């Protein structure tokens, strides 16, 4: 039995970080031998050397695309635009983060504007909270009235992805795995 | 009424503490990226600190652990508490509205802090 | 901390029609640079953001264009009000570093 990691990691086109794609994995043998280019592999709270021999209830695969400078924000207890308003990990996070450069796929000479991130948000984000609304942000006492003028801006800002940009600004495909152990009989066992 | 007005600057003996206030009109400080930028006399600009709408705060590497940025939503004021002031902190401080964390759209008139 | 260097320390033109200010970055910024103008004894005023986009209220005489490491700010006609100090600021990385400033004279 094979867990559907092929669809997760080798997806043709990922989603923006403001609306990140969550996939639930259960009832399959989870083998991490598949995770075998130049990528970052950070595991929090678990021993990465024996993820294959570790049996637990649910796997949550969350996939999103961010810049290279924002990869370090995907970690427990980190503060930043992505962490605060787009995607936040909890303090006690039992899982792993996998990020790899994707300049070949998610960049074009004209510029890639299919990816967006939430810039303006009144409050912070609870862990694993998804903010999809696109209402105009009120930065002043005057109403936005559904119009985007002074002190009333669209909350979603597009990324600028070009092949000629530096490594820090290049698009990075990030997949974070959240492992959940439940009192109910687990059904993900490598 | 887009004005930003700063106050609280003045002469302080080194190692002393001083609190700067930035009163804002037509700006909701709780809903905006606010920044403090200082200019030494006859020198270039140097960003000091920024506070996010959510509450996250960041400081320049030369001022962390001694400068604290804060906001009061009731009086719509931006505060900057600077403790253990050194002689290189002298200059004119500005409160600015940072569009996101990119650039400062508006600037206050600035107030002068002189360390002895 | 991308050190930002402005090639002309001072720039002395008659109040006619020409101006050019260059800002160079150590590593690439990718159109993440802004231009401010500081009149003497006054707060800085934002002119250009995104290295090519004007802000509200600044007239058509101000234009800017650049990408990567070299950025340029030009003034169509140099009206007397434009004789001040100009700064190039970056937001590609943290922190937001400024240039030394370029002062325009008559």
Residue numbers in the entry:
A (entry chain A): 334 to 369, 373 to 526
B (entry chain B): 1 to 116
C (entry chain D): 1 to 106
Sentences from the study reporting this entry:
The Omicron variant and its sublineages have spike glycoproteins that are highly diverged from the pandemic founder and first-generation vaccine strain, resulting in significant evasion from monoclonal antibody therapeutics and vaccines. Here, we describe several potently neutralizing IGHV3-53-using antibodies targeting the RBM, capable of Omicron cross-neutralization, extending to BA.2 and even BA.4/BA.5 sublineages. Structural analysis via cryoelectron microscopy of a representative broadly neutralizing antibody, CAB-A17, in complex with the Omicron BA.1 spike highlights the structural underpinnings of this broad neutralization. Here, we demonstrate that a common class of public antibodies can develop broad cross-neutralizing activity through affinity maturation.
All CDRs of the light and heavy chains of CAB-A17 interacted with the Omicron RBD through surface complementarity and specific hydrogen bonds. Remarkably, seven of the interaction-interface residues on the Omicron spike are mutated relative to the founder variant. In contrast, CAB-A17 LCDR1 SHMs, including a 1-amino acid (aa) deletion, changed the germline VSSS motif present in C102 to an LS-T. This led to a slight shortening of the backbone in a critical region close to the mutated Q498R, N501Y, and Y505H in the LC interaction area, enabling CAB-A17 to retain a favorable RBD binding mode. In addition, T28I and S31A in CAB-A17 remove the possibility of a T28-S31 hydrogen bond that is present in the gl antibody. This hydrogen bond stabilizes the 28–31 turn in a position where residue 31 clashes with the sterically locked RBD Y473. Furthermore, the HCDR2 Y58F hinders a clash with RBD T415. Specifically, the G26E, T28I, and S31A SHMs in HCDR1 preconfigure the loop in a conformation compatible with RBD binding.
